[PDB]
What we know:
part of a larger assembly, 2 chains, A: four-stranded parallel beta sheet, B: alpha+beta, five-stranded antiparallel beta sheet, 3 helices, 43% helix, DNA repair (chain B)
Amino acid sequence: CYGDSYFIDTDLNQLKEVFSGIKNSNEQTPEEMASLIADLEYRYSWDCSPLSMFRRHTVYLDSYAVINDLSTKNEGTRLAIKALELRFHGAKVVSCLAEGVSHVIIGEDHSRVADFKAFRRTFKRKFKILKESWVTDSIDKCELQEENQYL
Amino acid sequence: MERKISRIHLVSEPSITHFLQVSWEKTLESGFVITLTDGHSAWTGTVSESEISQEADDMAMEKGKYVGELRKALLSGAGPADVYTFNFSKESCYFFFEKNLKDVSFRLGSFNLEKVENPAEVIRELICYCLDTIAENQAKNEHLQKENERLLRDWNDVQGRFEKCVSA
């Protein structure tokens, strides 16, 4: 239906022209697109790419003075840039502490580590405790460093 | 409670500096206390609301402008295009300040001061207040320096990471 053909291979220019042929497609939702992307990466073995390696992990941050309260934003800290960079590298930043959260980032403030540990124990699925240094040291390596050294 | 210390040169003795402190509760309109010292003896006087209002009415001009001129004269707020002359007589203990203008002098104010019975206490209090002022301002300056250094470092780091983000 588009420019691409079946019996002749494709090149960069041909694919660009075929893409320009399409008009638009916005019938999907963020969850469906994320699931499709993850399935494609798993199927075609594209997880080694520099980005999209945080897609499979949901990340929560201690950017609220009180856990699960949106009226106490702590904007104006390095945690904001850390969260934003993580999301840029494909991370799914979640603003609500749901049971499906698998990663939590904690900064220099260890006051609420006990609350996080208690919530992890309560939940059926446990999320490993991580520090903001791990992502900073991992970005330059473009790979997921072991969490044993930054639990 | 607000206080302001100023240096002045009396025309009676135009060779030594005399220091005048104005202390007012909230604003200069209600009133203030004037303490004028030369390092050996100090003279203290008070001005209340009634005398300021009476002088303004005698001044034949609005109260707001009178208080503005008073602040510009006593509180060291004088700009470039204005000259003030202070005259103090010790035998009568009479103070008064005027505004020189091209060989034309306006008698802005005339106060009466009473010699204190102990200048050491007042001089010590003045220098103590000023020392506290410096001690407190130094802390603010150093804290602001620390915060600015931290902000500069953080800004540099964020921009450096933005370069890589854009490149990718």
